[PDB]
Design a protein around this nucleic acid. Structure first.
Ligand SMILES: [Mg+2]
Ligand SMILES: [Mg+2]
Ligand SMILES: [Mg+2]
Ligand SMILES: [Mg+2]
Ligand SMILES: [Mg+2]
Ligand SMILES: [Mg+2]
Ligand SMILES: [Mg+2]
Ligand SMILES: [Mg+2]
Ligand SMILES: [Mg+2]
Ligand SMILES: [Mg+2]
Ligand SMILES: [Mg+2]
Ligand SMILES: [Mg+2]
Ligand SMILES: [Mg+2]
Ligand SMILES: [Mg+2]
Ligand SMILES: [Mg+2]
Ligand SMILES: [Mg+2]
Ligand SMILES: [Mg+2]
Ligand SMILES: [Mg+2]
Ligand SMILES: [Mg+2]
Ligand SMILES: [Mg+2]
Ligand SMILES: [Mg+2]
Ligand SMILES: [Mg+2]
Ligand SMILES: [Mg+2]
Ligand SMILES: [Mg+2]
Ligand SMILES: [Mg+2]
Ligand SMILES: [Mg+2]
Ligand SMILES: [Mg+2]
Lengths: 152, 206, 262
RNA sequence: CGUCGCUACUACCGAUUGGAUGGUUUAGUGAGGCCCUCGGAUCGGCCCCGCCGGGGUGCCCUGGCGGAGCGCUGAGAAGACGGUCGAACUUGACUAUCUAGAGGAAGUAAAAGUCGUAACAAGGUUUCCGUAGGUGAACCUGCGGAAGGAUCAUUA
RNA sequence: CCGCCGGGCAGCUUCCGGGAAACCAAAGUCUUUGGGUUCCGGGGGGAGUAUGGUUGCAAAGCUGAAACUUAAAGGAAUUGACG
RNA sequence: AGCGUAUAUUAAAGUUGCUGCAGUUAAAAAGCUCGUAGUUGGAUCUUGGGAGCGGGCGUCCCCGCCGCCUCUCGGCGGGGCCCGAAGCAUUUACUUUGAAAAAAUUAGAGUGUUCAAAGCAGGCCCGAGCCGCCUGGAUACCGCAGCUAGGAAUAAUGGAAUAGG
RNA sequence: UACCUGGUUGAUCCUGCCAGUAGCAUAUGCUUGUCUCAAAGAUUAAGCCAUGCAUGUCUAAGUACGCACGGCCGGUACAGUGAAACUGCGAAUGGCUCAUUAAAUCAGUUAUGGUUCCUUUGGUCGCCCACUUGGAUAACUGUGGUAAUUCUAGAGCUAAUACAUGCCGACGGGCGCUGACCCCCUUCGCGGGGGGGAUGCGUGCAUUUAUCAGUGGUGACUCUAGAUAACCUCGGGCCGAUCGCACGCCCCCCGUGGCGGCGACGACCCAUUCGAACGUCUGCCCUAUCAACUUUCGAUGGUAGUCGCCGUGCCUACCAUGGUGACCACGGGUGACGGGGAAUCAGGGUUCGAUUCCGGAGAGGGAGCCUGAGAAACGGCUACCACAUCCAAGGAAGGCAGCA
RNA sequence: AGCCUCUGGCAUGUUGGAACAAUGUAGGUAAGGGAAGUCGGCAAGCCGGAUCCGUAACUUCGGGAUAAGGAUUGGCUCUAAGGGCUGGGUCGGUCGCGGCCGGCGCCUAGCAGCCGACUUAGAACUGGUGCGGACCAGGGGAAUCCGACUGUUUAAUUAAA
């Protein structure tokens, strides 16, 4: 179920999985030893990364990507793609003439690892600059905080 | 020629980028290898850096391995099975990274039959009786008998492999780039791997 | 561009081979070397521009191809071979041998040293390597690698390299309390003991530095190259000793030396 | 103030599937290069013999002169099948820009022609808006408005 | 009838203070310049025209240019002078 | 020794008005109303006070203090001591200090170019016997965004209520 | 220097404009004694171009046997100047111009842990021809064509650091697994323990694949390093084991064997330097008489691929059905190469910045190409298109946006 | 629809034989040109099916409209894509492979086997560019006049306005 769905076999490389000629059922209890990493900057590699049965190469909590540069935040506006969302960064660009500001935004597509469950729209989300991961997407979601506004 | 550039295609929004420069030696694309199975044929290519690149166009053999047993005899690649990308590359027998391929079992057989000294497939007593016991029947004993009785239970194989060795062909998957590298290197499909790809093959043919 | 650029316009030329707007179009361009183009002194500038030893470029050509000039005791015939922080430049038929320490304003001195003190030399370290078969490598700021270093040498520390041998001889880890000349930016060729550094992950790290008189500049780490255990620089310093006098003070102190001096 | 009269200049409308350049490109065709598959002018080398000479143990190692299998790898040009970028050419589409035009209708000039006299004084008919309808021209008349009036009132 | 109170329609009066002026409890708080915000004008005509778009069954509605020409057109109040 | 006209453009233009125009009549406020974006949005939350040093027995100006938490984390057989980590500055906006900011240009240190535009040298020591000394090539700005560190005045923004620290 | 004056009206106060004013920016009108600085075919036509030139190179150290000249002197190959020719570099910088280009150039900022790098620096280099083996062309010599070119026909020679080839080395010596086996202790013997092993196969710095363990290094390894199994990108990995000029030596020792300095090219691992490249964040002119755009002709994403230098809808296949928008997209325009600055200027702006400094682009226009580290290179070529020269009519040579 | 065939029906539509003249009536085809043809393009041919692409002026906002204008189409070998039907209550007990009870299971993401029509898309290969190959089968455009459209009409010369 669930994991091997696509066509080619999806597997964490740097775990070779088989060797077994001993008792204690078949395979281990974890069964597959799961490659995960700590990322850095203190963000807790979340539970569902380590627990998770799942597999996405582009997740930093379970695969090959390096986070390495510019850390930002935005808000989640659309989750209609698969393993990617759109965030929307708001601001004041300043004119000097007119000694005031105007609101702006540059929405930004961004990888969203499915470890990182129960996200919604109107959701504060922090992102790391990553490898240029798809055509638009250079950023990867690191800590969703769902915070400002509404409810647990 | 056949470039590789962000320079031409639309922007995120859908506006059309104008050009900028000409194509530069840079965003350079060569045509494909789409390497086959025949007697070896590889052309070099001169690339960026200086440096070179071993584009295989005919390729017969691979340096490609057990996972578990921890060996890798060099072996003939007999035939392509399915390739997840696309279903011309199967038919045309085009080896590319993550092709599933049949290969010769023979060089893997012939070091159990050294090491743990227990057969594969099943036979009456034609090859087995003259040659296995020619590998067995000791006149050293003591140290060795202890040794490949310490090579214990776990001279063992999964049924799924055990099967294939009857046939003298193993399922394996390419992990090098024949077009980039120059070789058709890989692992043996072993255990979990080995079970879609059969079930893919089975479901595919019907 | 197509290839790499083998040329340098005067003006674009950094602020310190100290060149003037007239006299030419081009500046000399460091031939590639150990030191980065922007933090150099192409030999040529010593000779005609700093010492007034030669006059022109051809005068310098005729110097270095007698083979008098020895940049760290190894003879250079390239008029544009780049020197930079912590070099030697022995003349030998003269017995002068200078360094290349920068002044308090950051503009490479004409600071003469002994015949001794042309052996010891300093070098900051850029990385530990672990090369192959566990043979460990340094990378000095002057692009020496030195195999087989003492395992307690870490990154950003300095080495008291010999010269005729290469090699290393004793060394200074980068703690608090030791002595720093600054090799980048603004507080440049300014000298003082550390105090405290501010580790940041990602963006490179800040280093607070106190000096003799008690003036705290800070810097990015990658500009600080150290020079002693603490209030004891192993090298001779330039007159001024990277203290840096406010234009106000400098003005008056220069002018106050004047009149009383006779 | 307007029609009307004459003269001059702008842009307008305008029958003419009006003309010209540019940019996209739908469709076709498609130079040359680049890749792939062949090819094989040829050129060797390896070799196999005939005969001969020098050195070695009939045989071998070298040498000389001839011949032939052109055996089997290498190099290898001209060429040809395919594929890919693709100028170019041909026909459509769009949009941009720019202009040719019989004849028609404004404005302006502008500024002194004729016929009136619309407006400003209660402008002789308070004036004006919108709408409508009319009329040689200002115009006129309905209806509803407006006072920017010609009444801040009409005398319980 | 006589008061008060809220919010309505209004009146007079005044050297607040405004206001080119006529006037204005507000058009007051403005070189002592900014409480919030919407619309919208930049000499007069050409012109609310041409063209384009759109709505309308259509009158028409809405959006809405330029070349050209033009020196004032205009507003408030003053004396005139003619009704 | 220049001086004229040709026109683009700036002040002049309080005639494009952010600062900073105007809308009874002068050109001008939709016929009226609803209303999504945008802009804009009352008040309300640590203080008075303490302890000292310093100006003018006490009173009145002037300064370092009473960021909290942690010590779950380092260590400068049981330790402390507190820095190393993080709760993190609710989450910013704001402000101040760093660092980084190519030169030329600019602002502007230094300088008998004979002055000046300039130039960056020059100055000196010297009767040259010195067979040579001495100093420069200053500095400030460098928007916004980005990076760092103080402050918490105001503006948002957050947290416990079908229970939770 | 915070700024005004003329003009509507019998006269007034306004709105408002016209007209003055100064600088700056470009025309040319006239005049011109000295001297110092000093811009210059950008706007129109990145239109066209006569001609003249703008990119060659030798130390002692890659070949040199031109008879060129000497030498100084030979016979021994050299000797020493040395015209040519092969070879290695460069020619990838500079110079010019701004046609295009509106988040595109570009600034600042960051990334490369999603990469390549000639050169310089530092390093590192021992597995029967090495007392170097083979072979082949240019100059050179001769015989040739064509009308003509920076056109070659063809016969002899002859070099190499050009092109191939491939050896001593190292230790029948050492260490991985295999091991003909063997010995001793223990055991009734099986078995348990201690040993020791001829002979095989391996006998690596790089390569690719596979696996295993966890000296040093980061906020950030799926890194470096280490262990095992393999292969050979194989001629087209490397070194592995490369060639000149100075010629100077010592030998428990006589002529061999050891040694000395310089260079040149290698190179592999590597560092480094000039970079180059592709990414992050944030930054632009006008326009709605442009409101929806984008999507089987990749639009956004996932998966798997091919290609490249690398991550990447760079491309293919199969899936999903996305992404942007009045915080004004999308569409159109520019008398738009982008910055750094300029003249203006009470404070705030306004326009200009083709302008020497930085960044980009293009050599009539496009495309493709060789070659190269490095170029899609125009002082290369290949066509086409677009231009244009000589002609013996068969053919040939054309690119000033190098300087004149 | 056309065209070829079984069942069923005929025997060429009131005669035959021999040639292949002119005129005819039915069919065909033409180099180069291409309406010059006549009163006039009178007849015929161009077009023609499907799939894909694509689409004007004008409007009664339905249409126009198969507008216009393009591409493809064979045979062969493949691939891909479209559905039905049945099956777990297994473990224990007990009763006769069957039932009943009770318990666990509970594919509730289904998976397994067994059936059977058809289509559609894409890819090779392949043939002297042939492929809607027999037949079926809209020539198009720009205008004016009339009549709103459907229909009807002078049976034996007018179908129109
Ligand atoms: Mg302002
Ligand atoms: Mg009026
Ligand atoms: Mg008002
Ligand atoms: Mg105001
Ligand atoms: Mg006007
Ligand atoms: Mg102005
Ligand atoms: Mg002003
Ligand atoms: Mg005004
Ligand atoms: Mg109103
Ligand atoms: Mg004045
Ligand atoms: Mg008058
Ligand atoms: Mg004026
Ligand atoms: Mg250049
Ligand atoms: Mg680098
Ligand atoms: Mg134009
Ligand atoms: Mg030209
Ligand atoms: Mg170019
Ligand atoms: Mg070109
Ligand atoms: Mg040229
Ligand atoms: Mg008949
Ligand atoms: Mg009949
Ligand atoms: Mg005909
Ligand atoms: Mg006719
Ligand atoms: Mg007909
Ligand atoms: Mg029609
Ligand atoms: Mg009809
Ligand atoms: Mg009839």
């Amino acid at each position: 179920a669930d994991i091997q769905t696509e066509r080619a076999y999806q597997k964490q490389p740097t775990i070779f999985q088989n060797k077994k000629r001993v008792l204690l059922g078949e395979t281990g209890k974890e069964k597959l030893p799961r490659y995960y990493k700590n990322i850095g900057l203190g963000f807790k590699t979340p539970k569902e990364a380590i627990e998770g049965t799942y597999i996405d190469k582009k997740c930093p909590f379970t695969g090959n990507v390096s986070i390495r540069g510019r850390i930002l935040s935005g808000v989640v506006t659309k989750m209609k793609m698969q393993r990617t969302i759109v965030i929307r960064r708001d601001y004041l660009h300043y004119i000097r003439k007119y000694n005031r500001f105007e609101k702006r935004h540059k929405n930004m597509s961004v990888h969203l690892s499915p470890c990182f469950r129960d996200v919604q729209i109107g959701d504060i989300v922090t992102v790391g600059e990553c490898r240029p991961l798809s055509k638009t997407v250079r950023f990867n979601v690191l800590k969703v905080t769902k915070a400002a506004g509404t409810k647990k | 020629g056949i470039s590789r550039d962000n320079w031409h295609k639309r922007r995120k929004t859908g506006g059309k980028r104008k050009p900028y420069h000409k194509k530069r030696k840079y965003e350079l694309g060569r045509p494909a290898a789409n390497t086959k199975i025949g007697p070896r044929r590889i052309h070099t290519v001169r690339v960026r850096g200086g440096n070179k690149k071993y584009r295989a166009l005919r390729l017969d053999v691979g340096n490609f391995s057990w996972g578990s047993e921890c060996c890798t005899r060099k072996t003939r690649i007999i035939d392509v099975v399915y390739n997840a990308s696309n279903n011309e590359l199967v038919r045309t027998k085009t080896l590319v990274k993550n092709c599933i391929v049949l290969i010769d079992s023979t060089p893997y057989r012939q070091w159990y039959e050294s090491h743990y000294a227990l057969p594969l497939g099943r036979k009456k007593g034609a090859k087995l009786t003259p040659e296995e016991e020619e590998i067995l029947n000791k006149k050293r004993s003591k140290k060795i008998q202890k040794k490949y009785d310490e090579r214990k239970k776990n001279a063992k194989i999964s049924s799924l492999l055990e099967e294939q060795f009857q046939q003298g062909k193993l399922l394996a998957c390419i992990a090098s780039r024949p077009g980039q590298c120059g070789r058709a290197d890989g692992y043996v499909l072993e255990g979990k791997e080995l079970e879609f790809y059969l079930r893919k093959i089975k479901a595919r043919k019907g | 561009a197509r290839g790499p650029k083998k040329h340098l316009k005067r003006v674009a030329a950094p602020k310190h081979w100290m060149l003037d707007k007239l006299t030419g179009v081009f500046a000399p361009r460091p031939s590639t070397g150990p030191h980065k183009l922007r933090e150099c002194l192409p030999l040529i500038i010593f000779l005609r521009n700093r010492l007034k030893y030669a006059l022109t470029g051809d005068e310098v050509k005729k110097i270095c191809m007698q083979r008098f000039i020895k940049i760290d005791g190894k003879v250079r015939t390239d008029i544009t071979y780049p020197a930079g922080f912590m070099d030697v430049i022995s003349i030998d038929k003269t017995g002068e041998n200078f360094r290349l320490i920068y002044d308090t304003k950051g503009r490479f001195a004409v600071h003469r040293i002994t015949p001794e003190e042309a052996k010891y030399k300093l070098c900051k370290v850029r990385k530990i390597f672990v090369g192959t078969k566990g043979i460990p490598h340094l990378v000095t700021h002057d692009a020496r690698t030195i195999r087989y270093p003492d395992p307690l040498i870490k990154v950003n520390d300095t080495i008291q390299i010999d010269l005729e041998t290469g090699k290393i001889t004793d060394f200074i880890k980068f703690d608090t309390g030791n002595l720093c000349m600054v090799t980048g930016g603004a507080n440049l060729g300014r000298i003082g003991v550390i105090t405290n550094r501010e580790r940041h992950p990602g963006s490179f790290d800040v280093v607070h530095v106190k000096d003799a008189n008690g003036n705290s500049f800070a810097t990015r780490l990658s500009n600080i190259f150290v020079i002693g255990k603490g209030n004891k620089p192993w090298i001779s310093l330039p007159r001024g000793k990277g203290i840096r006098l406010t234009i106000a003070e400098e003005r008056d102190k220069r002018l106050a030396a004047k009149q009383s001096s006779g």
